[PDB]
Design a protein around this ligand. Structure first.
Ligand SMILES: Nc1ncnc2c1ncn2[C@@H]1O[C@H](COP(=O)(O)OP(=O)(O)OP(=O)(O)O)[C@@H](O)[C@H]1O
Ligand SMILES: Nc1ncnc2c1ncn2[C@@H]1O[C@H](COP(=O)(O)OP(=O)(O)O)[C@@H](O)[C@H]1O
Ligand SMILES: Nc1ncnc2c1ncn2[C@@H]1O[C@H](COP(=O)(O)OP(=O)(O)O)[C@@H](O)[C@H]1O
Ligand SMILES: [Mg+2]
Ligand SMILES: [Mg+2]
Ligand SMILES: [Mg+2]
Lengths: 188, 469, 48, 62, 498, 467
C-alpha cells in the first residue's frame, strides 16, 4: 500500500481515520495550510440551516447529496483534496460526523505547527504581570519552537494555590490538595 | 524493520509498523526489556498493524515501545549440543549452565511431511507392561496416546516408559513438558541425572529437554510443543536415526490456544474452544511422523477434562494416534495400576497378521471375558453371587483374576506401593493370560495375582499367602 | 480510656480541618502565588 | 520548611486547639450523647461489679 | 493531652515534594472501570492514582484510551477527572513487620493498631521460580488433623487442595493447620517454624473477625498474617488479594524461612476476575469466565515452591480452598485447580452428616508426595492403617465369617479413631500413639460408640504419666523396638484399666 | 445543575449536562411530571452524558425534557417518626397519613462498617420452631436466610418468625418488602394494626415498613432494600438499639439489577445475570451486620429460581449468612410443614461450645439417622423395604418418625388448616428427639408424630388413634 505519512497526534475513531487519510494526502504534495483553510470554510458552508437540513435527512438519496456537494465545491473553488474528501464522506454517508473530522484535523494541524495546550486553574483571577511570568516559565517547560496555548480557567472549588497542565504534565500546588494530604496524614 | 507497540491486552500485543509489515508467524523482539520478550505475529489487521501473542509476560510494556523484526520465525538451537540441556519455547537455556553452542538454528514452524514420505511398516514395540503389550501393543515409529483425567497415572506411566524404552534405546530422545507442574519438571531432571541419561560432565547425554510449564503465559505453552517437535524433527532428519518424543500433556497446547483466541477476535465454537481447534492440532500432530528418512516414536499424555472422552480436544486427538491407552479412574479406584482400561484401549497393529494368532486370540479372549463380566455385574446387583449359574461364577472368577493380573508394579512407583518394579517379556504375558483363561489356575485366590510380574510370581505369592494363612 | 483517647483524637482532627478550611479563605495571594511560580521555576530547571 | 503556609497554618490551629481544650470545644450534644452511649455499652459488656476497689469472692470449699 | 501531641508528630513530617507528573482525563467511569485518556507512557498493569487519593491499575492499553480498574469505591470518580501515573507495577509491603496484622489486599492495615513498618516492597505479579531452584519436597507440614497427617500427608512446598461443598469443614481444616504451628513456632529451632498467611476472599467481614479472634484466642497471631479482601471490596481487590498474600509468602521462602498460605476461596477470585474482565469488555468464555481463567490460578499456585539449599532452603506451602456445587467436582474452576495442584482433600456432606468429621473422603483424597514428607513413625503406622481402611471400604456396603467380620470391626474402629474436634490439633507423636493403639488390634474388643472416649482419655493419660515416651518418639522420630515395647505395655495396661 | 434527556430506553435514561456533571449515585429530578420521578445516576459516558436508572415509570418522558440535579443521593427520612409508617423507595409515605416528620435524613448509599467495628458475640435466638431450633439454631445479631422455590413456605415461615420473635422483642423492627405481593403487604399492615404492633393514634409503634412490591419498575425494586437497610441502620448506629430487619424477597433485589444491567450495556455473565452480581450483593449485605454500635438480626427470604440451588443468585447469597434454612418442595409434598430440609440447613452456632452437649449430640444423631435413611431411599424405592436388614428397618422407622416429628403447626397457619399454633421451647424439643432417638417410642405409629407440639402430644395423639 501507499506508505502514508503519520500525523503527529494520533486521533482515533471514524473521524480519526478520515482525518489521518486527509493529513497523509495533504502532507505529500504539501497543501496542509490551504486544505485546513478550506476545511474551516466547509465548516460554515455545510452549517447553513438549509444545507444542514438537506444533508441530515437520510431519505434524500446519496446521489443527490453527492451532486449537491459537488455543486457547492465547484461554486467555492477548493483544492481537489478537499473536494474528494467531501465526496468520500458523502458516499460513505459520514456527513453527520463531518465536523468531528474538521475538529480532528484542527487538533492534528495545531500539533503539526507545534502547540502544547495548557491549562491554569486558580481560586481567583490573576494580575497580568503574574500571567506574564507564568507565560515565561511555562515556555521554559516546553521545547524549541513549541508555541504555547494558555487557558486560564477559574475554579473556586479549590481554596487557593495553582493547578497547571502542560500537555500530559501536571503540577498541582493547590491549597485543597495540601489540606487533603495533611488531613489524611493526621488520620493515619 | 522497526515497529511500535500500540496496544497491550492480556497476552495479546498489537504492534504498528511504519515501514513494511512482517509476515505472519515471524518473531519480533521488544526493545527495552531486561529479559528477552519475543512476540509472534498472528494476524495482519490492516492499517499496518499486526496482532501478536507474547511468548512471555507483557508486564511493563508501554504503548510506543520499539520492536525489532527478526525476519524469521522463532529459531531454536538444534544439534547434539542441546542434549542434556533444558530450553524455553524460544530456545534459550533454563538449566543455568551457559549458552547452547550449536551451529544450526531451526525454525519451529515447518510444513508437515508430504504423502510420498510415509512409512507403512509396523512392528510391535515391547514396553514391558502387561496390559499395554497384550491389549494395545505399541509400534516403533507410531504415535501413542495416554488419555485419562487427572490423578489416574499419566505422568507415572510416561515416566515408566522413559525408564524402560529410553534407557535401553540406542537413539536419542526428547521430552517436551507443555503446561505441566514445574515440580514434575525438576523431579524428572534430577531422576535423569541420577539414572545417567543426562550427563552433566561428559558429552554423553541421551535426552534433550524442553519445558514450558503452567506458569508461562499462553503464548509460550502454545509453542513449546513446536519447539520440542523441532528438536525431534532435526534428530530425525539430519542425524538420520531413531528418536523418541515424549510430550506431557498435549492438551495444554490446545488449551493455551483457547486462552488467546477470544482476544484475537475469533468467535468461540463448541464448548468454548477456538474455531481452529482441529486445524491447529493437525498442523502440529502432522509433523510428528515416521517418514522414510527417520523415525519418531511419539508418546503423548492427553488430559481429558473431567474424564469426559467426548470433549472436543481428546475427541479430536483420537484420530491422530495409532495406539491409545485410555487410563480410567473407575479402575484406579479399585487399586489396579496402571489403570489402563482394557476395553477402551486400541492399537493399529493389533491384528492377527502383525502380532500373531496366539497373541491376537489371547487378547480377544481377555477382552471378551471382561465384557461378559461387565454384563454379569448388572445381574449380581439384584441376585447376588450366591445365585449365579455355576458356569457364570466361573466367568466372574476368571474375569477378576484377569483384572488383577493386568496390574503391575513399576520401578518408578516404588515410593507409593513400596513394592519392586517388574518387567514382563511379551511371551510371559501371553502365556500368563492364556493359562488364566484356560483354567490352569482356577484354584489360586484372586489376591495372588494382584501386583506381580509373570504368572510364576503369582503362584509364589499364593504359596506365601497359604503358608502364612 | 483508649475509647476516649480515640474519640477526642477524631474530634481534634475534625475541628482543626474545619478551622483551616476557613482560615485559608483569607488572601495571602501575592506571596503564595509568587512561591508557586518559584516552584515552577525550580521544576522547569530541574526537568531537562 | 518555614514556607509551607498550609503546614504552619495547620500547626497554628493545632496550637489554638491545645490552649482552648479546657473543655471539649464545639462539643455539642452529640459529644455527651455518644460518650454516654459507648460508656454504657462498655459497662454492659464488661460487668457490673464494684467498679472502684476489689470485690471479694468468699468461695466455698469442696 | 499527649494524644494531640502524637497527632502533631504526624504533621511534623509531611510530603512537601510536588513533582511534574504525567496524567490523563477520565473519559468515562462506570461500574468500577475508568477509561482514561492520556497516560501515554503508562505501563501494563501499572498502579495509577486518582485525584481523590484512590488507587487503580491500568489493565487495558488500547490505542485510544487506557482501561483502569479502581481499587476501591467508584462513586468518587467523575468524568474529566485526573489520573496520575505512579510509575510502579502493583506491589505490596513485605516483611516480618506484617505478622499478627490484618491487612487488606493492598497491604494497608485494617485493624487500626497503627501502620505497617515494612521496609521493602514486592511486586504482586512475579514469575514463579524456575526448574533449577526447587528441590523435591522433604519435610512434613504438620496439619494436626489425624486423617490428613496419616492418610493424605502434606509436605512443605506442596500445593494441597481443599475442595468440597459449602459448610463441610474447609476453613476448619485451614484454621487447625494454622493453630497447630504454634508448638513449632514457640520452640527454638528455626527449621520448623512456619509462618502462616490466610487470604480471605469474598468472606463477609464478620467471618474474618470471628476467624481473627479465634486465632487470637489460640495465641496464633504471633506468626499469622490475614489478608482480607471481603465481599464489600471492589472486584479489583478480591482479584489481587491472592497475589498480595503470595508475595508476602514469597518474601519468607526467598529468605530461608518457611511459609504457609491459604487462599480461601479461589472460586471467588475467579468470580472477581470474571467481573473485571466483563466490565473491561473482554469477550467471555465458558460459563462467562474469561479465557485466561486457568492462567489466573496456574501462575498463582506455581509460586508455592521448595527452594534448594543454594537458594536459602525456604519453602512456601499452599492450601487453596475451592467450593463445588452439590459435589459437582466436574465443574470448570474445580477441574482447573484440580489439574493445577498436587494432592487434594475431598470433603463430602454425606460424610459430614454421617458423623465423620472432618469429612475427608480418604478414598478419593490424594497426595503426590505421599511417602516422602512423612515422619518415620507415621510412615510405619499409617501404612498399615491405609491398607486396613482400603480393605474395609470394599466390604462395607453391607453389615459373617470370623475373618471378614473382624476386618469390618477393625475398619470401623479405625474410622471412629480418625474423627476429631475443632481447633484442637494433636502433636504428631500423639497421633502416632492413638493410631498405633487403634491399628494393633487393641480396640477390637471395645465397642465402637465408645472409641472416642478411649481416644480422649488415653491422651490425657499419656500426656501426663508418659511424657518421656512421647518426647522419645518426637526426638528420635521413629517407633524403635524399645519404644514399641513400651507403647505395647502402656496400651495393654490402659485398655484393661478403663 | 440542568441537563436534558437524550435517550429513554426502558427504565434507563440518558441525561446530558453541558455544565457541571453530577457524581455517581447522585439523584436527579425530572422536571415536568405529575409526580416525583427520581433518576439515580449510574455511569458517566463521556461527552458530558450520564446514564441513570429511573425510580418510577418512565412513560411520558420526552427527549429533550429537563432534568435538575439534586446534589445528594436519594435521602430518605429516618428517625423514630418512621415507626408505624409505610415508605417507598424515595422515602415518600404511601399510607396516606401525612408527611413523615423527621429532622434527620439519611442517604441510602452509605458504606459498610469497617473491620474494627464487627462484634464477635454469638448467642442463640429461640424461635419456638422444632426444626429451626434443633438442627439450624438461629443466632442473635446474625444474618439468617430462608431458601426455597415458589410456594414452599418462605412467607408463612417469615410471618411465624415475625409473630414469635418480634412479639418477645423489646427493640424496634423493620420489614422491607422488596418484590413481593402487594396484598401480602396489606395483610401484614392490617395484622400489625390489629396486633397492637402499630398505633395509628399514638407513638408506641415498633415496626417500620418499607415496600417496593412487584408492581413497581426494575429501578424501584433494586433500590428499596437499601431504603430498608438505611432505616434499620439509623436505629442501630444512632439510637444504639437492637433491631430486627425482615426482608422478603431479597432475590428480587438481584433480579431487578439483571433487568437494568442489560439496558446499561453490560456483557451478561453466567445465566444472563449482570456481571456485577456478587459485588452488588456484597455491598448490600455487608451493611446488615451487627457492629459494636448495635445489633441487627436480619431474616431474609431468598427465592431459588426453578428450585435450582446451583443458580448464581442463591449460590452467592449462601456465603453471606450465618444460618440457612433450605425449604424444600420435595418435603412439602409429603405434607411436612415447615418444609425445612434438615440436611441442607446449617448454622454457625451449631457448636458444642455454644448450644451444649445434649443439644449438639441430639442434633448430630438426628442428622446421622436422616442421612442413613436418605442413603437407603434409592434401594427402598425399587427393591422395596423388605430387602433390608433389621438394623436398616429400625433406621427407616426411626427416620420416618423423626421426619414427621420435625413438622409443626404454626399459628399463622391456623386459618389454613384449623389446627392450633404451637411453640416448643428448646428443652422440650431436645428431650423429645432424645426419646425418639433412644427408641422409647418404637411402639407408636409414625403418623402419631405428624404435626404436634411437644412429644407428649404425640403420645396423646397415638392413644387417640388407638380408639
Ligand atoms: N471436625 C469438626 N467437628 C465438628 N464440627 C465441625 C468440624 N469441622 C467443621 N465443623 C462444623 O462445620 C461448620 C462449617 O465449618 P467451616 O466453616 O470450616 O466449613 P466451610 O465449608 O468453610 O463453610 P463455608 O464454606 O460456608 O465458609 C462449622 O459450624 C463447624 O461447627
Ligand atoms: N503405578 C502406580 N502405582 C500406584 N499408584 C500410582 C501409580 N501411578 C499413579 N499412581 C497414583 O497417582 C498419583 C500420581 O498420578 P499422576 O500420574 O502423577 O497424575 P496424572 O496422571 O493426572 O498426571 C500418585 O499419587 C499415586 O498415588
Ligand atoms: N406451616 C404451614 N402449614 C400449612 N401449610 C403451609 C405452611 N407453610 C406453607 N404452607 C402452604 O404454602 C402456601 C404458602 O406459600 P408461601 O410460603 O406464601 O409461598 P412463598 O414461598 O412464595 O412465600 C400456603 O397456601 C400453604 O398451603
Ligand atoms: Mg501429570
Ligand atoms: Mg469457610
Ligand atoms: Mg411469599
Amino acid at each position: 500500500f501507499a506508505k502514508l505519512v503519520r500525523p503527529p497526534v494520533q486521533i482515533y475513531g471514524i473521524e480519526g481515520r478520515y482525518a489521518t487519510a486527509l493529513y497523509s494526502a495533504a502532507s505529500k504534495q504539501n497543501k496542509l495550510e490551504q486544505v485546513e483553510k478550506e476545511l474551516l470554510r466547509v465548516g460554515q458552508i455545510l452549517k447553513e440551516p438549509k444545507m444542514a437540513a438537506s444533508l441530515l435527512n437520510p431519505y434524500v438519496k446519496r446521489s443527490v447529496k453527492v451532486k449537491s456537494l459537488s455543486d457547492m465545491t465547484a461554486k467555492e473553488k477548493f483544492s481537489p483534496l478537499t473536494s474528494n474528501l467531501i465526496n468520500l464522506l458523502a458516499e460513505n454517508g459520514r456527513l453527520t460526523n463531518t465536523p468531528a473530522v474538521i475538529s480532528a484535523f484542527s487538533t492534528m494541524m495545531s500539533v503539526h505547527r507545534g502547540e502544547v495546550p495548557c491549562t491554569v486553574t486558580t481560586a481567583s483571577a490573576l494580575d497580568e504581570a503574574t500571567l506574564t511570568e507564568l507565560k515565561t516559565v511555562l515556555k521554559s517547560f516546553l521545547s524549541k519552537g513549541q508555541v504555547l496555548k494558555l487557558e486560564v480557567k477559574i475554579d473556586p472549588s479549590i481554596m487557593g494555590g495553582m493547578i497547571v497542565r502542560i500537555g500530559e504534565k501536571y503540577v498541582d500546588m493547590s491549597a485543597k490538595t495540601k489540606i487533603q494530604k495533611l488531613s489524611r496524614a493526621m488520620r493515619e | 524493520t522497526t515497529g511500535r507497540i500500540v496496544a497491550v491486552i492480556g497476552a495479546v500485543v498489537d504492534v504498528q509498523f511504519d515501514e513494511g509489515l512482517p509476515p505472519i508467524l515471524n518473531a519480533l523482539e521488544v526493545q527495552g526489556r531486561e529479559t528477552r520478550l519475543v512476540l509472534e505475529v498472528a494476524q495482519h489487521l490492516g492499517e499496518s498493524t499486526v496482532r501478536t501473542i507474547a511468548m512471555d509476560g507483557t508486564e511493563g510494556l508501554v504503548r510506543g515501545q520499539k520492536v525489532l523484526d527478526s525476519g524469521a520465525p522463532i529459531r531454536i538451537p538444534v544439534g547434539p549440543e542441546t542434549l542434556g540441556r533444558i530450553m524455553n519455547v524460544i530456545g534459550e537455556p533454563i538449566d543455568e549452565r551457559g549458552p547452547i553452542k550449536t551451529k544450526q538454528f531451526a525454525a519451529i514452524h515447518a510444513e508437515a511431511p508430504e504423502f510420498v514420505e510415509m512409512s507403512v511398516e509396523q512392528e510391535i514395540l515391547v514396553t514391558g507392561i502387561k496390559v499395554v503389550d497384550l491389549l494395545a501393543p505399541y509400534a516403533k515409529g507410531g504415535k501413542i496416546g495416554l488419555f485419562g483425567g487427572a490423578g489416574v497415572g499419566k505422568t507415572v506411566l510416561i515416566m515408566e516408559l522413559i525408564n524402560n524404552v529410553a534407557k535401553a534405546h540406542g537413539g536419542y530422545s526428547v521430552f517436551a513438558g507443555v503446561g505441566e507442574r514445574t515440580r514434575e519438571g525438576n523431579d524428572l531432571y534430577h531422576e535423569m541425572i541420577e539414572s545417567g541419561v543426562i550427563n552433566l560432565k561428559d558429552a554423553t547425554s541421551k535426552v534433550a529437554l524442553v519445558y514450558g510449564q503452567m506458569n508461562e503465559p499462553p503464548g509460550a505453552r502454545a509453542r513449546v510443543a513446536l519447539t520440542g517437535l523441532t528438536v525431534a524433527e532435526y534428530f530425525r532428519d539430519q542425524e538420520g536415526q531413531d528418536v523418541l518424543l515424549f510430550i506431557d500433556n498435549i492438551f495444554r497446547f490446545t488449551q493455551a490456544g483457547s486462552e488467546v483466541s477470544a482476544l484475537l477476535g475469533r468467535i468461540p465454537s463448541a464448548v468454548g474452544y477456538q474455531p481452529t481447534l482441529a486445524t491447529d492440532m493437525g498442523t502440529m500432530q502432522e509433523r510428528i511422523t515416521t517418514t522414510k528418512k527417520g523415525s519418531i516414536t511419539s508418546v503423548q499424555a492427553i488430559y481429558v477434562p473431567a474424564d469426559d472422552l467426548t470433549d472436543p480436544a481428546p475427541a479430536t486427538t483420537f484420530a491422530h494416534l495409532d495406539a491409545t491407552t485410555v487410563l480410567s479412574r473407575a479402575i484406579a479406584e479399585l487399586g489396579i495400576y496402571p489403570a489402563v482400561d482394557p476395553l477402551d484401549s486400541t492399537s493399529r497393529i493389533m491384528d492377527p497378521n502383525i502380532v500373531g494368532s496366539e497373541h491376537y486370540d489371547v487378547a480377544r479372549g481377555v477382552q471378551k471375558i471382561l465384557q461378559d463380566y461387565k454384563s454379569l455385574q448388572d445381574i449380581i446387583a439384584i441376585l447376588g453371587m450366591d445365585e449365579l449359574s455355576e458356569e457364570d461364577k466361573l466367568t466372574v472368577s476368571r474375569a477378576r483374576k484377569i483384572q488383577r493380573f493386568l496390574s503391575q508394579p513399576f520401578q518408578v512407583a516404588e515410593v507409593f506401593t513400596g513394592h519392586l518394579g517388574k518387567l514382563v517379556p511379551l511371551k510371559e504375558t501371553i502365556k500368563g493370560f492364556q493359562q488364566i483363561l484356560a483354567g490352569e489356575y482356577d484354584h489360586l485366590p484372586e489376591q495372588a495375582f494382584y501386583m506381580v510380574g509373570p504368572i510364576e510370581e503369582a503362584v509364589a505369592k499364593a504359596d506365601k499367602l497359604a503358608e502364612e494363612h | 480510656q483508649n475509647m476516649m483517647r480515640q474519640k477526642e483524637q477524631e474530634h481534634m482532627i475534625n475541628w482543626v480541618e474545619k478551622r483551616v478550611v476557613q482560615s485559608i479563605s483569607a488572601q495571602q495571594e501575592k506571596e503564595t502565588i509568587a512561591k508557586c511560580i518559584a516552584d515552577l521555576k525550580l521544576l522547569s530547571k530541574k526537568a531537562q | 520548611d518555614p514556607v509551607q503556609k498550609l503546614f504552619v497554618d495547620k500547626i497554628r490551629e493545632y496550637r489554638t486547639k491545645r490552649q482552648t481544650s479546657g473543655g471539649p470545644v464545639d462539643a455539642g450534644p452529640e459529644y455527651q450523647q455518644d460518650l454516654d452511649r459507648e460508656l454504657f455499652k462498655l459497662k454492659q459488656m464488661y460487668g457490673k461489679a464494684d467498679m472502684n476497689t476489689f470485690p471479694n469472692f468468699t468461695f466455698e470449699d469442696p | 493531652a499527649e494524644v494531640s501531641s502524637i497527632l502533631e508528630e504526624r504533621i511534623l513530617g509531611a510530603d512537601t515534594s510536588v513533582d511534574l507528573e504525567e496524567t490523563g482525563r477520565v473519559l468515562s467511569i462506570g461500574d468500577g472501570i475508568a477509561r482514561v485518556h492520556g497516560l501515554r507512557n503508562v505501563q501494563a498493569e501499572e498502579m495509577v492514582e486518582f485525584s481523590s487519593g484512590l488507587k487503580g491499575m491500568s489493565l487495558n492499553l488500547e490505542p485510544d484510551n487506557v482501561g483502569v480498574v479502581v481499587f476501591g469505591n467508584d462513586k468518587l470518580i467523575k468524568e474529566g477527572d485526573i489520573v496520575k501515573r505512579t510509575g510502579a507495577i502493583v506491589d505490596v509491603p513485605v516483611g516480618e513487620e506484617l505478622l499478627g496484622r490484618v491487612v487488606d489486599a493492598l497491604g494497608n492495615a485494617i485493624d487500626g493498631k497503627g501502620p505497617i513498618g515494612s521496609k521493602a516492597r514486592r511486586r504482586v505479579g512475579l514469575k514463579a521460580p524456575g526448574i533449577i531452584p526447587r528441590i523435591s519436597v522433604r519435610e512434613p507440614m504438620q496439619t494436626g488433623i489425624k486423617a490428613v497427617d496419616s492418610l493424605v500427608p502434606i509436605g512443605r512446598g506442596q500445593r494441597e487442595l481443599i475442595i468440597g461443598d459449602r459448610q463441610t469443614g474447609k476453613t476448619s481444616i485451614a484454621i487447625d493447620t494454622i493453630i497447630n504451628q504454634k508448638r513449632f513456632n514457640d520452640g527454638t529451632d528455626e527449621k520448623k517454624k512456619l509462618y502462616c498467611i490466610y487470604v480471605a476472599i469474598g468472606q463477609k467481614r464478620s467471618t474474618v473477625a470471628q476467624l481473627v479472634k479465634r486465632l487470637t484466642d489460640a495465641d496464633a497471631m504471633k506468626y499469622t498474617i490475614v489478608v482480607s479482601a471481603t465481599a464489600s471490596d471492589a472486584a479489583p481487590l478480591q482479584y489481587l488479594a491472592p497475589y498480595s498474600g503470595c508475595s508476602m509468602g514469597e518474601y519468607f521462602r526467598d529468605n530461608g524461612k518457611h511459609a504457609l498460605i491459604i487462599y480461601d476461596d479461589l472460586s471467588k477470585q475467579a468470580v472477581a476476575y470474571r467481573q473485571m474482565s466483563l466490565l473491561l469488555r473482554r469477550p467471555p468464555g465458558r460459563e462467562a469466565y474469561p479465557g485466561d481463567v486457568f492462567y489466573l490460578h496456574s501462575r498463582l499456585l506455581e509460586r508455592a515452591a521448595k527452594m534448594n539449599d543454594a537458594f536459602g532452603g525456604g519453602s512456601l506451602t499452599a492450601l487453596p480452598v475451592i467450593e463445588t456445587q452439590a459435589g459437582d467436582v466436574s465443574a470448570y474452576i474445580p477441574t482447573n485447580v484440580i489439574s493445577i495442584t498436587d494432592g487434594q482433600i475431598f470433603l463430602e456432606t454425606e460424610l459430614f452428616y454421617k458423623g465423620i468429621r472432618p469429612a475427608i473422603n480418604v478414598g478419593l483424597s490424594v497426595s503426590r508426595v505421599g511417602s516422602a514428607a512423612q515422619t518415620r513413625a507415621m510412615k510405619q503406622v499409617a501404612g498399615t492403617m491405609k491398607l486396613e481402611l482400603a480393605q474395609y471400604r470394599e466390604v462395607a456396603a453391607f453389615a459373617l465369617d470370623a475373618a471378614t467380620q473382624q476386618l469390618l470391626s477393625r475398619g470401623v474402629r479405625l474410622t471412629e479413631l480418625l474423627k476429631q474436634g475443632q481447633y484442637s490439633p494433636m502433636a504428631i507423636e500423639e497421633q502416632v500413639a492413638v493410631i498405633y493403639a487403634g491399628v494393633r488390634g487393641y480396640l477390637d474388643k471395645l465397642e465402637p460408640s465408645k472409641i472416642t472416649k478411649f481416644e480422649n482419655a488415653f491422651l490425657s493419660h499419656v500426656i501426663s504419666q508418659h511424657q518421656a515416651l512421647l518426647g522419645k518418639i518426637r526426638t528420635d522420630g521413629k517407633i524403635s523396638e524399645e519404644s514399641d515395647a513400651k507403647l505395647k505395655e502402656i496400651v495393654t495396661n490402659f485398655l484393661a484399666g478403663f
